[PDB]
Design an enzyme around this catalytic site. Structure first.
Site, PDB file in Angstrom:
ATOM      1  N   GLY A   1       7.510  -0.389   5.733  1.00  8.36           N
ATOM      2  CA  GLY A   1       7.621  -0.125   4.317  1.00  8.36           C
ATOM      3  C   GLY A   1       6.381  -0.540   3.579  1.00  8.36           C
ATOM      4  O   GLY A   1       6.340  -0.481   2.358  1.00  8.36           O
TER       5      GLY A   1
ATOM      6  N   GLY B   1       5.779  -0.913  12.519  1.00  8.92           N
ATOM      7  CA  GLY B   1       5.695  -2.090  11.653  1.00  8.92           C
ATOM      8  C   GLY B   1       5.507  -3.439  12.351  1.00  8.92           C
ATOM      9  O   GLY B   1       5.846  -3.607  13.525  1.00  8.92           O
TER      10      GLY B   1
ATOM     11  N   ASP C   1      -0.235   5.924  13.514  1.00  9.74           N
ATOM     12  CA  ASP C   1       0.767   5.303  12.674  1.00  9.74           C
ATOM     13  C   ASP C   1       1.574   4.299  13.507  1.00  9.74           C
ATOM     14  O   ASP C   1       2.571   4.652  14.158  1.00  9.74           O
ATOM     15  CB  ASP C   1       1.666   6.385  12.107  1.00  9.74           C
ATOM     16  CG  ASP C   1       2.613   5.882  11.001  1.00  9.74           C
ATOM     17  OD1 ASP C   1       2.710   4.652  10.724  1.00  9.74           O
ATOM     18  OD2 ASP C   1       3.261   6.768  10.377  1.00  9.74           O
TER      19      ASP C   1
ATOM     20  N   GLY D   1       3.556   1.110   3.777  1.00  7.87           N
ATOM     21  CA  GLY D   1       2.834   2.323   3.398  1.00  7.87           C
ATOM     22  C   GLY D   1       1.980   2.890   4.534  1.00  7.87           C
ATOM     23  O   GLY D   1       1.092   3.724   4.313  1.00  7.87           O
ATOM     24  N   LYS D   2       2.236   2.446   5.758  1.00 12.82           N
ATOM     25  CA  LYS D   2       1.498   2.995   6.887  1.00 12.82           C
ATOM     26  C   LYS D   2       1.597   4.500   6.933  1.00 12.82           C
ATOM     27  O   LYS D   2       0.575   5.174   6.929  1.00 12.82           O
ATOM     28  CB  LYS D   2       1.984   2.413   8.225  1.00 12.82           C
ATOM     29  CG  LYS D   2       1.912   0.904   8.320  1.00 12.82           C
ATOM     30  CD  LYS D   2       2.464   0.442   9.648  1.00 12.82           C
ATOM     31  CE  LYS D   2       3.985   0.656   9.827  1.00 12.82           C
ATOM     32  NZ  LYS D   2       4.829  -0.289   9.069  1.00 12.82           N
ATOM     33  N   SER D   3       2.833   5.004   6.982  1.00 13.72           N
ATOM     34  CA  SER D   3       3.099   6.424   7.106  1.00 13.72           C
ATOM     35  C   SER D   3       2.571   7.114   5.871  1.00 13.72           C
ATOM     36  O   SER D   3       1.896   8.126   5.995  1.00 13.72           O
ATOM     37  CB  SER D   3       4.588   6.708   7.277  1.00 13.72           C
ATOM     38  OG  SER D   3       5.210   5.909   8.296  1.00 13.72           O
ATOM     39  N   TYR D   4       2.803   6.552   4.685  1.00 16.24           N
ATOM     40  CA  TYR D   4       2.310   7.187   3.451  1.00 16.24           C
ATOM     41  C   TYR D   4       0.828   7.346   3.523  1.00 16.24           C
ATOM     42  O   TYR D   4       0.303   8.382   3.159  1.00 16.24           O
ATOM     43  CB  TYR D   4       2.635   6.387   2.202  1.00 16.24           C
ATOM     44  CG  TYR D   4       2.159   6.984   0.896  1.00 16.24           C
ATOM     45  CD1 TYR D   4       2.919   7.902   0.219  1.00 16.24           C
ATOM     46  CD2 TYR D   4       0.969   6.583   0.323  1.00 16.24           C
ATOM     47  CE1 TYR D   4       2.495   8.433  -1.016  1.00 16.24           C
ATOM     48  CE2 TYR D   4       0.527   7.098  -0.899  1.00 16.24           C
ATOM     49  CZ  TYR D   4       1.293   8.021  -1.568  1.00 16.24           C
ATOM     50  OH  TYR D   4       0.855   8.517  -2.773  1.00 16.24           O
TER      51      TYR D   4
HETATM   52  N1  LIG Z   1       0.512   3.717  -1.784  1.00 13.60           N
HETATM   53  C1  LIG Z   1       1.720   4.031  -2.324  1.00 13.60           C
HETATM   54  N2  LIG Z   1       1.997   4.268  -3.648  1.00 13.60           N
HETATM   55  C2  LIG Z   1       3.255   4.572  -4.072  1.00 13.60           C
HETATM   56  N3  LIG Z   1       4.314   4.663  -3.221  1.00 13.60           N
HETATM   57  C3  LIG Z   1       4.151   4.429  -1.897  1.00 13.60           C
HETATM   58  C4  LIG Z   1       2.821   4.108  -1.389  1.00 13.60           C
HETATM   59  N4  LIG Z   1       2.883   3.921  -0.079  1.00 13.60           N
HETATM   60  C5  LIG Z   1       4.173   4.099   0.257  1.00 13.60           C
HETATM   61  N5  LIG Z   1       4.907   4.398  -0.819  1.00 13.60           N
HETATM   62  C6  LIG Z   1       6.325   4.656  -0.688  1.00 13.60           C
HETATM   63  O1  LIG Z   1       6.855   3.455  -0.123  1.00 13.60           O
HETATM   64  C7  LIG Z   1       7.783   3.817   0.908  1.00 13.60           C
HETATM   65  C8  LIG Z   1       7.384   3.193   2.235  1.00 13.60           C
HETATM   66  O2  LIG Z   1       6.198   3.820   2.650  1.00 13.60           O
HETATM   67  P1  LIG Z   1       5.982   4.096   4.192  1.00 13.60           P
HETATM   68  O3  LIG Z   1       4.661   4.759   4.349  1.00 13.60           O
HETATM   69  O4  LIG Z   1       7.182   4.665   4.877  1.00 13.60           O
HETATM   70  O5  LIG Z   1       5.802   2.633   4.801  1.00 13.60           O
HETATM   71  P2  LIG Z   1       5.822   2.393   6.382  1.00 13.60           P
HETATM   72  O6  LIG Z   1       5.255   3.618   7.003  1.00 13.60           O
HETATM   73  O7  LIG Z   1       4.925   1.191   6.479  1.00 13.60           O
HETATM   74  O8  LIG Z   1       7.293   2.250   6.635  1.00 13.60           O
HETATM   75  C9  LIG Z   1       7.821   5.347   0.989  1.00 13.60           C
HETATM   76  O9  LIG Z   1       8.864   5.919   0.180  1.00 13.60           O
HETATM   77  C10 LIG Z   1       6.506   5.736   0.390  1.00 13.60           C
HETATM   78  O10 LIG Z   1       6.559   7.065  -0.112  1.00 13.60           O
HETATM   79 MG   LIG Z   2       6.598   4.598   8.659  1.00 11.35          MG
END
Ligand SMILES: Nc1ncnc2c1ncn2[C@@H]1O[C@H](COP(=O)(O)OP(=O)(O)O)[C@@H](O)[C@H]1O
Ligand SMILES: [Mg+2]
Ligand SMILES: Nc1ncnc2c1ncn2[C@@H]1O[C@H](COP(=O)(O)OP(=O)(O)O)[C@@H](O)[C@H]1O
Ligand SMILES: [Mg+2]
Lengths: 328, 328
Positions: free
Chosen positions: B99, B247, B244, B101-104
């Site tokens: 959570g 976590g 990716d 933001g890795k995937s984002y």
């Molecule tokens: N840089 C950002 N700005 C705004 N929202 C974000 C950002 N990065 C992630 N989010 C939101 O936060 C949530 C978790 O991001 P995600 O990439 O899934 O984290 P992880 O891949 O580490 O689990 C998702 O709903 C994503 O869309």
């Molecule tokens: Mg992810």
């Protein structure tokens, strides 16, 4: 004094997009918390009111009457799932311009889950819970998933193979259970996990838009369907049809979405079901034996496009289906 | 005085989540626009500064030094692609807690596209543009995609078949081009459209989390890789590795992500590459012939989890690779 279900009609206005946000972009939709009313305002040629079975205000978080994804399910989704378990054929379709929030509503996000996973989750909990509540009864779930695009049907769950010759399924007719797709893969699913897997698979198999960088084609309709069979020696099954339609903005790449409008028009104010693949496949859902819901999605900024979506929704309240309960 | 590349390290703090937002949840991260500094503050046991190659402030939109997805690419992503076309092996991995933001970051959204599609788009534009700028030269792209999960490797692009016996690929070793996955499907891709199709497929094939309703397993690492071959009678190829990671929070379901830490540790302050599948396959990206970037993702609220991410990123600055230019 006759047994026809009315099509349930519901609207959901979404929040501004960053793009619009940037622009101090105007907001021209208003929903009353109390009355289930939606008003199309005049930006600073006229003001229009409409009433719907629900008017979902999903436009501003901090508003008192904000409608979350969970709240949308809790209204529409759940009640329809009840009907399914009581043996009705259900069908919910999202309609509206591209970017209005059809996909967000139906499918939502990993952490913003929409109608579909919601339903799936709900469904399986029921089944699980209906173990020791009703042990002589038991359930049996298959999911299938296909999109139509350019009047072509493709099996979103079918395996896909490099040097791709994209492969189209045939549409044919159960003299008893309507139209259907000849040979669409239906996949027995034992749990949430399993279902929401095949959901994800099918999903990433949709037609890729070439207009965004990274999207599903705004002109592809997709039909996710959960067939649910309840066994007691004796069994009967209902089918959950959940649709993410191609955007509505003002074989032929259009036919389907446009002749759909023609149908709804026919059913309210010969219904041309077969003038298009989509409408023919949904023939039954739009006037056959289906408890059916339309979710008009609207953009808070787009005037004519929203006025159109609304006009249809309004017109669709008049459609009546002949929804029954199945048995064998 | 020696030819080693330093691992490029970069961090990106993300915006609050609605869940956190709800709580008037505190923010404990602060990035200096000017210095590329990231500070872990003390919530209302200590305050810690770090410096990175870039400290990306992606936590509040209306901030002066806000870092868009585009701006993240324009810093890290592009430069790296440059290196690719110059014939270097590249590798960028996202690391941080679930959570964070890795995937984002790596992948982003249909209308929030991250590193990967960005790269793909950039790539293909270059190739397109390198037509009439350099017509005796021409390019040749194949994409492959796999995740490791529970020390198992699966081919995310391989077709998948019902009554699924999930099927695991083997790891064998090019005496010359490192470790690799025996028989991973590589798919020649002719366009953006084609590539971002295969990305979408592979994606919806990843392991499904059973903790969320509708999500990818927090414990699956995915490696998206573009092999790019430039032909002139004579040709050479660089490979773009985009990762990716699972976590980082507090065959075995963990081995990989934890022994990765042990590796980064070894390379800064016998490197145990083979004590895990992931680290063995990335052996080369983490100290072999690879221009390599880490993107530490951090949550703006999670103290210890962020401090750990940061510790590693800090430690990773010290890693040096032996990045060359390839030829045949
Ligand atoms: N840089 C950002 N700005 C705004 N929202 C974000 C950002 N990065 C992630 N989010 C939101 O936060 C949530 C978790 O991001 P995600 O990439 O899934 O984290 P992880 O891949 O580490 O689990 C998702 O709903 C994503 O869309
Ligand atoms: Mg992810
Ligand atoms: N109800 C909503 N509230 C806030 N943001 C939304 C909402 N619905 C959609 N969005 C965002 O708006 C964008 C367009 O939504 P999408 O569902 O793709 O529209 P369509 O399916 O009609 O193209 C997406 O980024 C989506 O996440
Ligand atoms: Mg959509």
């Amino acid at each position: 004094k006759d047994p026809g279900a009315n099509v349930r009609v519901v609207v959901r206005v979404r929040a501004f997009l960053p793009r619009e946000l940037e622009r101090n972009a105007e907001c021209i939709v208003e929903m009353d918390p109390a009355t289930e009313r939606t008003s199309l305002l005049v930006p600073q040629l006229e003001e229009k009111s409409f009433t719907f079975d629900k008017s979902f205000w999903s436009h501003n978080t901090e508003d008192e009457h904000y409608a979350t994804q969970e709240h949308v399910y809790d209204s529409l989704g759940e009640e329809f799932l009840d009907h399914n378990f009581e043996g009705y054929h259900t069908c919910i379709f999202a309609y509206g311009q591209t970017g209005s929030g059809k996909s967000y509503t139906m499918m939502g996000t990993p952490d913003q889950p929409g109608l579909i996973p919601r339903t799936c989750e709900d469904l399986f909990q029921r089944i699980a819970s209906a173990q020791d509540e009703t042990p002589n009864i038991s359930y049996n779930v298959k999911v299938s998933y296909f999109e139509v695009y350019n009047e072509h049907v493709r099996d979103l769950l079918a395996p896909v193979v490099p040097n791709k010759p994209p492969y189209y399924l045939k549409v044919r007719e159960s003299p008893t259970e309507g139209p259907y797709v000849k040979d669409l893969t239906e996949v027995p699913v034992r749990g949430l996990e399993e279902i929401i897997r095949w959901m994800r698979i099918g999903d990433g198999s949709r037609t890729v838009a070439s207009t965004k960088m990274n999207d599903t084609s705004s002109r592809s309709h997709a039909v996710f369907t959960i067939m649910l069979k309840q066994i007691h020696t004796t069994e009967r099954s209902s089918r959950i049809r959940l649709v993410d339609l191609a955007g509505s903005e003002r074989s032929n790449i259009n036919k389907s979405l446009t002749t759909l409008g023609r149908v709804i028009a026919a059913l309210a104010d010969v219904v041309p079901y077969r003038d298009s693949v989509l409408t023919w496949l949904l023939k039954d859902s739009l006037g056959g034996n289906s408890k059916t819901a339309m979710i008009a999605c609207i953009s808070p900024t787009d005037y004519d496009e929203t006025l159109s979506t609304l006009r249809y929704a309004d017109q669709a309240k008049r459609i009546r289906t002949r929804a029954v309960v199945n048995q064998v």
